[PDB]
Write a protein that holds these residues in place. Sequence first.
Motif, mmCIF file in Angstrom:
data_model
loop_
_atom_site.group_PDB
_atom_site.id
_atom_site.type_symbol
_atom_site.label_atom_id
_atom_site.label_comp_id
_atom_site.label_asym_id
_atom_site.label_seq_id
_atom_site.Cartn_x
_atom_site.Cartn_y
_atom_site.Cartn_z
ATOM 1 N N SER A 21 -4.524 14.954 18.535
ATOM 2 C CA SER A 21 -4.897 14.686 17.156
ATOM 3 C C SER A 21 -4.556 15.849 16.211
ATOM 4 C CB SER A 21 -6.397 14.407 17.099
ATOM 5 O OG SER A 21 -6.810 14.238 15.731
ATOM 6 N N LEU A 24 -0.684 16.294 15.819
ATOM 7 C CA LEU A 24 -0.066 15.252 15.005
ATOM 8 C C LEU A 24 -0.400 15.451 13.536
ATOM 9 C CD1 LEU A 24 -0.873 12.040 17.143
ATOM 10 C CD2 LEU A 24 1.603 12.954 16.520
ATOM 11 N N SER A 25 -1.675 15.709 13.218
ATOM 12 C CA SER A 25 -1.980 15.834 11.790
ATOM 13 C C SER A 25 -1.279 17.078 11.189
ATOM 14 C CB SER A 25 -3.495 15.755 11.510
ATOM 15 O OG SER A 25 -4.134 16.852 12.057
ATOM 16 N N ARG A 28 2.274 15.946 10.582
ATOM 17 C CA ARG A 28 2.340 15.082 9.405
ATOM 18 C C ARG A 28 2.254 15.884 8.114
ATOM 19 N NH1 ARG A 28 4.781 10.447 10.479
ATOM 20 N NH2 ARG A 28 3.658 9.092 12.066
ATOM 21 N N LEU A 29 1.445 16.931 8.085
ATOM 22 C CA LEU A 29 1.336 17.728 6.882
ATOM 23 C C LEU A 29 2.689 18.356 6.510
ATOM 24 C CD1 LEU A 29 -0.422 18.964 4.612
ATOM 25 C CD2 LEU A 29 -0.999 20.856 6.137
ATOM 26 N N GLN A 31 5.731 17.478 7.580
ATOM 27 C CA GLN A 31 6.676 16.402 7.338
ATOM 28 C C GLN A 31 6.518 15.870 5.931
ATOM 29 O OE1 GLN A 31 5.811 12.690 9.262
ATOM 30 N NE2 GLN A 31 7.889 11.876 9.291
ATOM 31 N N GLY A 32 5.260 15.612 5.513
ATOM 32 C CA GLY A 32 4.998 15.194 4.125
ATOM 33 C C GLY A 32 5.508 16.210 3.110
ATOM 34 N N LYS A 33 5.306 17.493 3.386
ATOM 35 C CA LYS A 33 5.786 18.492 2.430
ATOM 36 C C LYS A 33 7.303 18.370 2.235
ATOM 37 C CE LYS A 33 2.189 22.008 2.786
ATOM 38 N NZ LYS A 33 1.670 23.234 3.381
ATOM 39 N N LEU A 35 9.205 15.786 2.834
ATOM 40 C CA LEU A 35 9.540 14.547 2.156
ATOM 41 C C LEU A 35 9.246 14.652 0.653
ATOM 42 C CD1 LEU A 35 8.136 11.858 4.700
ATOM 43 C CD2 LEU A 35 10.558 12.385 4.149
ATOM 44 N N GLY A 36 8.198 15.383 0.283
ATOM 45 C CA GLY A 36 7.864 15.534 -1.126
ATOM 46 C C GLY A 36 8.914 16.375 -1.851
ATOM 47 N N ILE A 37 9.400 17.410 -1.192
ATOM 48 C CA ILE A 37 10.509 18.216 -1.731
ATOM 49 C C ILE A 37 11.768 17.361 -1.941
ATOM 50 C CG2 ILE A 37 12.051 20.132 -1.209
ATOM 51 C CD1 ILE A 37 9.653 21.322 0.448
ATOM 52 N N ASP A 171 1.794 5.619 16.685
ATOM 53 C CA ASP A 171 2.175 6.604 15.653
ATOM 54 C C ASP A 171 3.666 6.884 15.811
ATOM 55 O OD1 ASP A 171 2.882 9.627 15.284
ATOM 56 O OD2 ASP A 171 1.299 9.240 13.824
ATOM 57 N N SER B 26 -4.205 11.959 10.343
ATOM 58 C CA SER B 26 -2.732 12.074 10.330
ATOM 59 C C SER B 26 -2.183 11.432 9.056
ATOM 60 C CB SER B 26 -2.145 11.465 11.574
ATOM 61 O OG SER B 26 -2.266 12.349 12.669
ATOM 62 N N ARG B 29 -3.022 13.640 6.047
ATOM 63 C CA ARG B 29 -2.181 14.832 5.977
ATOM 64 C C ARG B 29 -0.781 14.499 5.465
ATOM 65 N NH1 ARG B 29 -5.161 19.251 5.521
ATOM 66 N NH2 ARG B 29 -6.595 19.611 7.286
ATOM 67 N N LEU B 30 -0.237 13.356 5.867
ATOM 68 C CA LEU B 30 1.099 12.977 5.410
ATOM 69 C C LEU B 30 1.144 12.843 3.877
ATOM 70 C CD1 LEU B 30 4.062 12.051 6.159
ATOM 71 C CD2 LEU B 30 3.133 9.663 6.330
ATOM 72 N N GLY B 33 0.616 16.264 2.234
ATOM 73 C CA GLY B 33 1.817 17.080 2.235
ATOM 74 C C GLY B 33 2.831 16.602 1.218
ATOM 75 N N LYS B 34 2.983 15.283 1.087
ATOM 76 C CA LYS B 34 3.950 14.778 0.114
ATOM 77 C C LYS B 34 3.618 15.304 -1.288
ATOM 78 C CE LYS B 34 5.526 10.491 2.387
ATOM 79 N NZ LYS B 34 5.348 9.043 2.734
ATOM 80 N N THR B 41 7.879 21.837 -5.838
ATOM 81 C CA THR B 41 9.287 21.675 -6.251
ATOM 82 C C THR B 41 9.449 21.473 -7.746
ATOM 83 O OG1 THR B 41 9.824 20.643 -4.116
ATOM 84 C CG2 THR B 41 11.475 20.408 -5.797
#
Lengths: 353, 365
Positions: A21, A24-25, A28-29, A31-33, A35-37, A171, B26, B29-30, B33-34, B41
């Motif tokens: 757990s 993974l979290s 994900r944090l 990965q999200g960063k 993707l946001g960039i 997941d 999870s 957090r995704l 982070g996005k 940016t």
Amino acid sequence: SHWIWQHKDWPHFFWDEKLLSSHLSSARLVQGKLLGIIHTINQQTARQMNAFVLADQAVDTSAIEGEHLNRDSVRSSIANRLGLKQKPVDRYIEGLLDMLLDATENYEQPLTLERLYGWHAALFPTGYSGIHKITVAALRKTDPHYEAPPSKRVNKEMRIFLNWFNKKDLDGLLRAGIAHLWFELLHPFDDGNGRIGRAIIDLTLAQDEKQNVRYYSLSSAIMQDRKNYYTQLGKSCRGNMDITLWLIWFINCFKTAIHQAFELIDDITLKSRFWEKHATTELNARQIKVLNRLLDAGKKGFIGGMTTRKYTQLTKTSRTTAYRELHDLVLKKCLKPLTKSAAYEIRWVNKEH
Amino acid sequence: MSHWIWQHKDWPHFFWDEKLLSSHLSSARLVQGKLLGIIHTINQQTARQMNAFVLADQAVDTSAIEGEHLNRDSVRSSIANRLGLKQVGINKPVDRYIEGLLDMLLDATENYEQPLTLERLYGWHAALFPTGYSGIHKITVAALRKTDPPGKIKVHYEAPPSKRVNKEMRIFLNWFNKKDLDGLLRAGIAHLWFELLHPFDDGNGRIGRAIIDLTLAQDEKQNVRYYSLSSAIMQDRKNYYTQLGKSCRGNMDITLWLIWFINCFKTAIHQAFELIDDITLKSRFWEKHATTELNARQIKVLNRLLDAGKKGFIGGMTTRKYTQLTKTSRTTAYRELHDLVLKKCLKPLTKKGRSAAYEIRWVNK
């Protein structure tokens, strides 16, 4: 009873859910960063990023297997494919690129035997792996230190694998890690199982992100961590169905790939911000040549910084001219001194300018 | 139904289903982070506009949860002065409550490296009750309650007796400052635990939601809130109190609360996505029209419409609306609105000219 695929519970992989757990979290944090960039940078910057990562993907997934591509041929083919500026067609490079692009662009399509056969034909045009004739675009009919399941089992094992893969009931990051290990343990082809398995990872992550471009490369992270990769595969293939340790290794590899991608996109935007700020700066060809060489090394820079001697190795000018032109670059705020012969590094243009 | 949760023999040892929560954490957090990657940016000016807007939502909504209804223009004026933004309205005398509320919200997210202590909570409590009164009632300010616990939602909950509150708070603060668990779980636990203690005569909800801000700032190492859980809680106010379950919570199993709390976090993040999208649409519009010739009236009206974001004005921009914002004649409005369509700033919001209305012609990437 020595190999995992002889286990009575094969292929029912399981793992310690409470332990995974937090891995993974935290994956994900980041990965999200990333993707946001990617969502926020402009299309020109994303296309450059895409070009860099794709060249690393091709080169590194090949280097994992000991095959060293002409990087100029790779870059030239990617530039044609993406429409960027800038020889004979290299059939192996085109086939490798076509497989990698099918895996991330056609992510809504299922993984099928026919699709894997097409990837395999893309990797093996002549029907040979080195000196050895192999079966191409079909599952192996004979045996591939690890013993893979006997070939009479391979077609059923692959039907089970693919029925599982196309359910997408887990997941996305775990599916990527399980799919990679499962495919590798089956070794379903005579050769090319490493590159096709890493393309399966790409397909899984593109499905997870709904993103038809890979902005990071697990092959580049696997290659960087290749000793642990082989040690972990070797441990897993002799283990039971508890693949907790494999998945932790795989999530850490994914995180490494994201972090390398942060560094790349940071280097790309640092450089373009630098040249936006200094296109008004008067500089001669030599200074522009040297600044570009140093900017392409990114935030990490040159080990000793830029020196007069390195400046004269790159420009072929006299020491006196290099010494003065370097001071000129300090005065114009392009470079700044380092700390114990003089050395200089890029003065980055941070935030807005 | 027999005992308050703080009478349970295992109080305050909350627990939850780690396996069920994994997929919620999870997923949270995704999207977190996005948002953080977007924020990292965009340029400084854009991040600051986002900051000012979220901070006004934070102030207005955390007050509105308690039935305290702030003038949004006053809040914006005070935020603009603090963040060095262009002045909002004529500088009027300060509302001590608005400035104290902002002082608390800003201390919670900017000083995230400092622990939470009783002294820090007392300072927040003094900021919220500068007169010493909560409405008509004189209350204990800048100290824990010494007695028993508008549009405020009444819940018939009994908090621990005041003779126990200082001990209960010391236990809570010792747990809080350990920072030994996932940051989102810590924020959810901290808020529930603080709410169940009702340590102050009044102000417990606002202080409890500032503790959430402190926790998320510590999790993100981010001295600005780019999303607001008060704004999310305001859309689900009734469920918020229900999910708190103060009455009949009963066991130390807080699985359902933490899942609700993680969903509220995601709602807040999804609202911030829409906001940053609206903010960047506006700056992109003004980048394309930096060369477009416009007079001060046309610029005033476009700024008012752009500030409504993608959703626009209900009914769009009309001639009459143009004259209400500019004090011009109808014929000047017809010419200037036509001019704005010609210059590609506005576009017909309807296909019929019987009734005519306009919306922003958005500039995409």
